[PDB]
Design a protein around this ligand. Structure first.
Ligand SMILES: [Cl-]
Ligand SMILES: [Cl-]
Ligand SMILES: [Mg+2]
Ligand SMILES: [Mg+2]
Lengths: 146, 146
């Protein structure tokens, strides 16, 4: 019931992605039996300080999706103003400002945007937020040697 | 050494996919630590008997990739002339005719082509190959009720 509608919605999101796959992103569920676990990658955008870097994500969708957002974690360590120690992200689109008409594509696009411009307000990683502004060269070194 | 060059090649394949993602397909590795396991989906092409159906794959790449192809299996049951009982596929591109300059994109494109036109010669599933030709209506029913 709850899980029937969430499975149908994830399949609808999958249909959207395959018809018009977004650039900079890869993403696919673990399997049909594990449709609620997706793995994704995002590549650092051109003209960003993360340009060309590759970053690895897992999205774990709840059974009442899309009433609630997936849990989103970076599964490879990252040094980023908007990512907590355990890899969880700080992004209002998938937290307090979640909308039930957002899709997997919405989510991946919004995560990619954190590599276009980090959010400096109330950062999850304050050292990363300060270093990003104060010393971009050293910030790049910390990203690489994480 | 062997595994360093295979990791670099998988990251290169990942870069190709994110820059120009192919339509009809989703695909992403499990994680960086498990870069050798990818999950993918293919959607039944327009004008095929599988039109709009969604099919689920796992690709397990060996440590000496791209000298050897990944093992490719459908992880959801499928009734298809070129798929064995355990989900393994019969496709020369990823078997005897593997080329070391093929990529993940090459592989996914070639698997998608089995849903454009099945291969009738020496089929892995002879009942499916016969039914596909002899009774398309019943073949569609067997696909759906697998
Ligand atoms: Cl849940
Ligand atoms: Cl191996
Ligand atoms: Mg878009
Ligand atoms: Mg192509």
């Amino acid at each position: 019931k709850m899980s029937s509608s969430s499975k149908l919605r994830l399949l609808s999101d999958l249909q959207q992605l395959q018809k018009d796959p977004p650039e900079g992103i890869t993403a696919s569920p673990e399997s049909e039996n594990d449709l609620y676990v997706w793995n994704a990658t995002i590549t650092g955008p051109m003209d960003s300080i993360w340009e060309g870097g590759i970053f690895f994500l897992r999205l774990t969708f709840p059974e009442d999706y899309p009433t609630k957002p997936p849990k989103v974690k970076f599964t490879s360590k990252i040094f980023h103003p908007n990512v907590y120690k355990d890899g969880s992200i700080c992004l209002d689109i998938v937290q307090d400002k979640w909308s039930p008409i957002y899709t997997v594509d919405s989510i991946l696009t919004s995560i990619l945007s954190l590599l276009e411009d980090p959010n400096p307000d109330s950062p999850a990683n304050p050292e990363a937020a300060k270093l990003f502004v104060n010393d971009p060269k050293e910030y790049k070194k910390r990203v690489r040697k994480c």
